[PDB]
Structures are given as structure tokens and as C-alpha cells.
């Protein structure tokens, strides 16, 4: 239950009030793609989240140039 | 070449313009001229009625020159050795106005990439050369040790 | 005459040479910031932009970029 | 370091200023400078965006130095005995500008507190030494009475 410990240490949404199921999906999704390049720093991760959004938009907009 | 500035805001954002500054003017339909003439190094196979005219001003002249791909391939005389009757073709790729300069022309010739690198290795020597007077003490040791010197020159 | 003492004596008695000469009655103030030189480059590595650094807070925003 | 003065009143209160005196000046927003650099003997664990800047002028420099707690702990060479390869760590606590002086550095080293006390005991001797010439009369008695002298040196 270490993922519950990261939510309770996160004092913005700790005691299971609102948005605790969405942010739990946010932590677990980033770890599944983290193994392509191991790094431990939050401001690089603020770029590594953005580097997982630019590569995500290459996956989505190439599909939305084909559904359109 | 960028002044460090702050994020813009309702507060006032002073930036030392190290620059000085010009001015501008405007008209009706501008006096448009069409400069026609041979601007690349070949003859394009498309007929004239399909190719396009590109608009150039002072700000986009570096982008019109880059997208033209002025590739000049010619055979010129070889003056890098003792041969008079030698020739050496080149390969040129021009993307800016500074690519006409011999700093970027010689950088695109691989026979001249080793000669600027030769000079950069000689400018690097001149600094620590005359400062330490123990270099000439081991030039005579390299004058003595001729066998171990030539084994290291090939490396 | 020790490398821990003398480097921390010149960095502090040299401040007294900057305090004793400057006339604080003639509209002068001086702020004193404890960093170390290896910490400061890490603090510029800390923020993704120089406009969000920790030294930018003390040079610009706590001083110049401040009402009054 | 305080002049004896009277209580202030509607009568006039003259106080010999043994001092002489200076003057002062003022401006707009003062030319504020930020002196940045390593001022203590470690690296603080708090990040930079939370620690503060302290304002120093001539009157509060003794209070900024005291509240910094410049604690310099290092291992230095031991030159108090016949050993060359001996070391002796120290413990320093600085609260004023006079704490850099060897009067207050040696006072914070317990191996040097006994050597200044040794010297203070020797300066105390020199006064009544050469005034009474009966001291050397009992130095020969201590030269004679060797047993009772060594029993009192341990006390």
C-alpha cells in the first residue's frame, strides 16, 4: 500500500476527499512509461511528462488526421 | 544573441536596448519588381508555367537561400600538393550568406578540414610553447631517442 | 592559516572592509546571501528557466521586482 | 564605555563629549548591493528559495556575526609537544570581530587555556621576584630540601 502512502503524503488531496482516484491514475501511468529512461528529478520529470505529451500527441493527432 | 528579459506583465518591462534603432514606411500596392535570372547551378526540368516566384525581403533572405539548396559541384585545380596537373572536385552546400566565406567553404571540403585542424593544433601549441623552457630540453631527448619517437608518430 | 579558517576569514573580514568604507548614512544598504558556489549552479540547474530560479527570487523579485 | 550623564529635563544637559564626531547623508532607493558568496563553513541543507538575505550596516555587523554561528571545526597540526606527526582538532565559536584575534582563539582552545594561564602565573611572579632578595635564599633551601619540595609540586 505504498501508493496510498504517496497520496497521504501529498497534502493537497490526502484524506480521500476529491480527486484522489484521478491522481492515483496519474502516478501509476507515469511509472509504466518511466522504464524507457530512468531518471530521478522532478523538474526534469516536469519535462519528461511533457516529453510524454509530445510523443502522445504524435500518436493522437496522427489518428485524428485519419478519423477526419 | 538574446537579451535576458522578464515575463511581460501589468508592471513595466524595461529592457536595455543595447541596440540603437531604425524606422519604417508604407505605400499602396508596393512598387513590386521581378528579379529574373539564373540563380542556381543547373537548368530545372520543370517548364516555366509551373514553377513559382518567391518573395524576398531583408528578414527572410536567410530562409530563401537555405530552401533553394544551391549545390555547386565542380572540378577545380589541386594546389595542395606538388602536382600541377592534378584536379580535385568539391561538394558545396549553402544555407546562409556566411557560407560564401572561406570559413564555411573550407569546412565543406574534407581536404581542407584537415588543414584548419592542422592550424588549430598549431595555434594550441604556441601558447604553452614559450612559457615553459623545458620543452627544448626534451626536443634534444627526442633528438637522442629516435626509435621511440617514430613509433609514437604513427599513433 | 587553515584552508577552512582562512577561506572563511577572508570571505568575512573582507565584508567588514566593505561595511567600514561605505557610508550607510548616504543612502546605501547591502544584502548578505549565504550560498555556496557549487550550490548556485545546481540552483540554476534546479529551475527550467532563469526566470524561475532561486537566485532570481533574491536579485529580482525580492528587490527590484517588488512594489516599494 | 558610558559617559556618566544626568536625567534629561527642561534644564540643559551638558555632556562632555570626549568623542569627536562625524556626519551622515541620504538618497532615494539606496544603491543596494547583494554580496553573495560562501560565508560559513558548510553547505546548508535548505534550498535556496527559502533562505533569507540579511541587511548589514556598521551598527549591526556585530549582531549579524553573532547570529550566524560561524562554528569552524577542523583538525590542525599539533606543535605543542615533540611530535611532528601529531594532530589536534579545535572547536571555535565566533561572536564578535575580536574573536578572530589570537586572544579569543586561544581562549577557546583548552590546550591553550593552560598556556596563557601558565604565562599569567609567570607575569605575576616577575613583580615580587627581584624586589625581595630573600627568594634566592630559600631556592637553596629547596635545593637542600628535595623531599618536601617534590611532595608539594604534585599539589
Structure description:
The structure is cut from a larger assembly and holds 2 copies of chain A (68 residues) and 2 copies of chain B (155 residues). Chain A has 68 residues and is mainly α. Chain A contains 3 helices and no strands. Chain A has helices spanning 2-9, 20-32, 42-60. Chain A starts with a helix and ends in an 8-residue tail after the last helix. The relative contact order of chain A is 0.08. Chain B is mainly α and 155 residues long. In chain B, 30% of the residues lie in helices and 4% in strands. Chain B is built from 5 helices and 2 strands. Chain B has helices at residues 61-68, 102-105, 110-126, 135-144, 147-153; strands at residues 75-77, 87-89. Chain B has a two-stranded antiparallel sheet. Chain B is flat and about 85 Å long. Strand 1 (28-34) of chain C pairs parallel with strand 1 of chain D.
Task: Give a quick summary of the entry.
The structure is cut from a larger assembly and holds 2 copies of chain A (68 residues) and 2 copies of chain B (155 residues). Chain A is an all-alpha fold and 68 residues long.
Task: Assign an overall shape of chain A.
Answer: extended
Cα radius of gyration of chain B in angstroms? 27 Å
- The computed structural class of chain A is mainly alpha
Oligomer: part of a larger assembly
N/C terminus separation of chain B: 41 Å
- Helix and strand succession of chain B? HEEHHHH
How big is the Rg of chain A? Answer: 15 Å
**Terminal residue distance of chain A:** 44 Å
Q: Order the strands across the largest sheet of chain B as they lie in space.
A: 1-2
What fraction, in percent, of the residue positions of chain B are helical? 25-40%
Beta content of chain A? under 5%
Q: Which protein chains make the most extensive interface, counting residues with beta carbons within 8 Å of the other chain's beta carbons?
A: C-D, 41 and 40 residues
Give the biggest beta sheet of chain B: 2 strands, antiparallel
The percentage helix of chain A is: 55-70%
> What form of chain B results from the Cα inertia axes?
flat
Structural class of chain B: mainly alpha
Helices and strands of chain A, in order, run as HHH
The number of helical segments of chain B is 5
Q: Tell me about the biggest sheet of chain A?
A: none
Count, helices of chain A = 3
Protein name (chains B, D): Type VI secretion system contractile sheath small subunit
Organism (chains B, D): Vibrio cholerae
Protein name (chain C): Type VI secretion protein
Amino acid at each position: 500500500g505504498s501508493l496510498l502512502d504517496e497520496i497521504m503524503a501529498q497534502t493537497r488531496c490526502a484524506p480521500s476527499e476529491e480527486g484522489y482516484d484521478i491522481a492515483k491514475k496519474g502516478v501509476a501511468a507515469f511509472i509504466e512509461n518511466l522504464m524507457g529512461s530512468q531518471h530521478s528529478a522532478e523538474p526534469v520529470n516536469k519535462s519528461l511528462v511533457d516529453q510524454m505529451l509530445v510523443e502522445l500527441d504524435k500518436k493522437i493527432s496522427a489518428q485524428m488526421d485519419e478519423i477526419l | 544573441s538574446k537579451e535576458g528579459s522578464v515575463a511581460p506583465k501589468e508592471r513595466i518591462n524595461i529592457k536595455y536596448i543595447p541596440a540603437t534603432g531604425d524606422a519604417q514606411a508604407e505605400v499602396e500596392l508596393p512598387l513590386k519588381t521581378l528579379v529574373v535570372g539564373d540563380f542556381k547551378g543547373h537548368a530545372e526540368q520543370t517548364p516555366l508555367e509551373e514553377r513559382a516566384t518567391v518573395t524576398v525581403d531583408k528578414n527572410n533572405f536567410e530562409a530563401v537561400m537555405r530552401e533553394s539548396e544551391l549545390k555547386i559541384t565542380a572540378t577545380v585545380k589541386n594546389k595542395l600538393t606538388d602536382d600541377e596537373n592534378a584536379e580535385l572536385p568539391v561538394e558545396l552546400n549553402f544555407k546562409s550568406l556566411a557560407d560564401f566565406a572561406p570559413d564555411a567553404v573550407a569546412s565543406q571540403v574534407p581536404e581542407l578540414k584537415k588543414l584548419i585542424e592542422l592550424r588549430e593544433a598549431l595555434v594550441a601549441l604556441k601558447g604553452p610553447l614559450g612559457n615553459i623552457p623545458a620543452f627544448r630540453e626534451r626536443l634534444q631527448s627526442l633528438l637522442n631517442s629516435e626509435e621511440s619517437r617514430e613509433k609514437l608518430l604513427a599513433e | 592559516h587553515n584552508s577552512q579558517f582562512q577561506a572563511m576569514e577572508s570571505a568575512w573580514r573582507g565584508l567588514k572592509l566593505f561595511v567600514d568604507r561605505t557610508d550607510f548614512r548616504e543612502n546605501n544598504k547591502v544584502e548578505i546571501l549565504h550560498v555556496t558556489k557549487d550550490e548556485l549552479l545546481e540552483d540554476f540547474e534546479f529551475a527550467p528557466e532563469t526566470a524561475q530560479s532561486g537566485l532570481y527570487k533574491h536579485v529580482y523579485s525580492a528587490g527590484y521586482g517588488q512594489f516599494g
